[model samples]
Target: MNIFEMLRIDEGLRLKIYKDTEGYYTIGIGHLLTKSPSLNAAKSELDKAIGRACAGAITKDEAEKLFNQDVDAAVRGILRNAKLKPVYDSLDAVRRCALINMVFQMGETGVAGFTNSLRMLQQKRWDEAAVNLAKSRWYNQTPNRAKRVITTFRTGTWDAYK
Candidate 1:
């Protein structure tokens, strides 16, 4: 599958709006419409997705559009950061997908804080990078997801695809 589809699975798709782990308003494929500039558009889109009056639903096609935009932003956010760009570019596609997945969940700014881990990743110190990533608040908060991504990093495989 493609990176976005993998992410869709990792993030968990829901057609109806609901609270996230942090109790934020989230919808389809982890879209945090509550924090986005598309709040009005989101409501509008939900109405369309449900084909009637509604405030908490989305169709697959609509969600995919949001998912694509979010992924685009995440990728650009990573590549725009001088610190992450080169490192991100050096990895194999599978490893790159792992980084994208991490950035997707945490944002580039959040992943940017993994200085040592990024350095290790750049240096091809897979085990060290995985270890460093595992020793984070992110990992503590979402160990299952973190481990899958970390394993992908360490092995340069689609271990996180499931």
Candidate 2:
């Protein structure tokens, strides 16, 4: 599966407004409405798309559009990071997806804090990279999802896609 499909599964789909683990007002496929560039713009768009005041509701199509936009923004931020860009460029598709997955869950700044892990990945030290990632608070917060991403870094496999 592609990043979009993987994210869809991991993030899950929610048509109604819900508080995320971080206690932020979120909607759609992990769309942090509170953190959006313009809350009014986003809400207006959703309202228009749904043909009424969206309030907390979003259509699947509208959700997908937001998901795509968020993913694109995440990717752009990752690629522009001076430290991560070279490492990302050297990775294979599965590994690339894994890195992007990480950035998706945590913002670029959050992922940038994984200094040793990123170095290990750049060095192609798969096991070391996985170990470094596992040492993170991120791993502790979301065990299964973090394990999947770490495993992709370690094995460079598409097994997570299944």
Candidate 3:
């Protein structure tokens, strides 16, 4: 590639920060902003996002749109992974929805770490998958809120977790 494009593209963001960029101390390639809490701050942002919702800082439609838009991309990423392909194409929408929730909650790599569950899922072992989902730290960390996804894995019913 030409030096102009190289400098213009890759270097622009870093340079922006050094202009001492009009941004709040960016964390990565830029999108999110500060007071930047950590490498992945979605965990931190969730509570504040909830607070904003409750405070009417953002509207319900805006909130619905965020998850609708984001989860579409999340499902796309899940589909593109070679390793996860079989499970994804097991093509049952409820199972896929459960995985979609997982990807949104923990990210693809993070969800991928639920090795036993994914394996059983690929094998169509629904009951076994429930056991796998139930015994993890994830279960304890989020069992109540996570019930719908886990129950869907267990029984293939997608209802509102909330």
Candidate 4:
């Protein structure tokens, strides 16, 4: 599924998808429409916000302004739960980003909560990593999305976004 489909928003509120210079489609709250600005203008602001956030340049006030409560809480939870494993050393940026995106969708606790999977990924065993990834509750919770990302990581071709 596309990012928009994963987000589950209605078409009227769906932000127009745009490719970042890195080619990922960002769809956090600021990307959606607001009253003061035209949709195009809002999108520009959202893009800027996303750029800043991704670059670690966002201020606390900017984060609060853009994400409000739920989204901010959720994203924080994802970051909190991510365990930087030793196997991460073997992973390229694409694989790392894909894993982070999965954790963002599933929540870090929900994804890294899998002890066995975390161990496997840390060990640099590709087959084990794939299996561990598939064995998670997240695999059942969001099968299609989980599978797509896991497959990309397994094949070592996951460089489309970072």
Best-fitting candidate, scored by TM-score: 2
Best by lDDT: 2
Q: CA lDDT, every prediction? A: 0.82, 0.83, 0.56, 0.51
lDDT of 3 at 92: 80
TM-score for each of the candidates: 0.86, 0.87, 0.61, 0.48
Query: Candidate 2 — which residues are off by over 4 angstroms?
Result: 35-52
Encode model 1's per-residue lDDT on 1-162: one tens digit a residue. Answer: 678777977888888876677666678888775654455666765676446676667678877877888899989988899888989899898888888898888778888889999999999999988898999999998888888889999998775565
Q: Give lDDT tens digits, candidate 2, residues 73-143.
A: 98999899998798899899989998898888898899998999898899999998888899878889888
lDDT at 11, model 2: 89
* Model 1 RMSD, rounded to 1 decimal: 3.6
Kindly report which residue stretches of model 4 are placed more than 4 angstroms away from their true locations once superposed: 1-82, 85-90, 159-162
lDDT of 3 by residue, 1-162 (tens): 222222123222321111113323331222222345342343335335445423213344544444455556677888887766678898486667677667755668878788888889888888888888888776786666466567767877644332
Candidate 3: segments with Cα more than 4 A from true spot: 1-56, 159-162
RMSD in Å for all candidates:
3.6, 3.3, 14.2, 11.0
Error of 1 at 64 (Å): 0.7
1 versus 4: better lDDT goes to: 1
**Candidate 1: C-alpha lDDT:** 0.82
Instruction: Please list all clashing residue pairs in model 1, or write none if there are none.
Output: none
